[PDB]
Amino acid sequence: GTFQFHSPGGKTEIFYDEGERAPVSEIRGEGLTSDSVSLADYKDKIVVLNAWGQWCAPCRSESDDLQEVHEYLGDKGTVVGINVRDYSKNIAQDFVKDNGITYPSIYDPPFKTAAQLGGVPASVVPTTIVLDKQHRPAAVFLREVTAQDLIKVIDSL
């Protein structure tokens, strides 16, 4: 009954009609700038998941836009980062303060979260998943995204 990410078939993005959606598993973990971070804290709210690392040039490039989306969602939801392959936590935290990123991140160096996200490719960073209010993916992006990529999906929800 939980989300399973099936073959993208050469494509860098996938969209899901309400009819074909399933909820993601439980996502909880050590925060990057907080004790814990948990999707359950945003029940019935829109949630944009983003796997990133400061070592990652596309992630740095798309960082401002994810901040934009986070702000655009406001009350209605949140961005939640999944910081992967940053084995030194302090530089990932430095990146978040330096760029005025105000949304939480799960600190997950080996990207174990990928397994709970229905087998989204751990090789692909950045990855952005837009969850609807039932925390079911409406869109998966296997590529850097712009703020309008996400907003367009956001609005459809």
Side-chain angles (χ1 to χ4, degrees), residues 23-34:
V24 279
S25 310
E26 188 209 51
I27 312 289
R28 205 150 188 182
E30 178 193 333
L32 178 66
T33 54
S34 178

Side-chain angles (χ1 to χ4, degrees), residues 72-125:
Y72 177 96
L73 285 156
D75 252 346
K76 305 306 201 299
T78 192
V79 176
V80 175
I82 300 176
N83 176 236
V84 306
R85 266 159 231 158
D86 261 318
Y87 303 116
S88 284
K89 195 180 192 179
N90 55 351
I91 192 170
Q93 307 167 317
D94 280 336
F95 179 84
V96 149
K97 181 180 197 58
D98 280 6
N99 289 277
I101 303 317
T102 66
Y103 58 84
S105 278
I106 296 183
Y107 184 67
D108 176 16
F111 200 4
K112 282 174 175 304
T113 300
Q116 292 137 53
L117 287 176
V120 144
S123 57
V124 182
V125 179

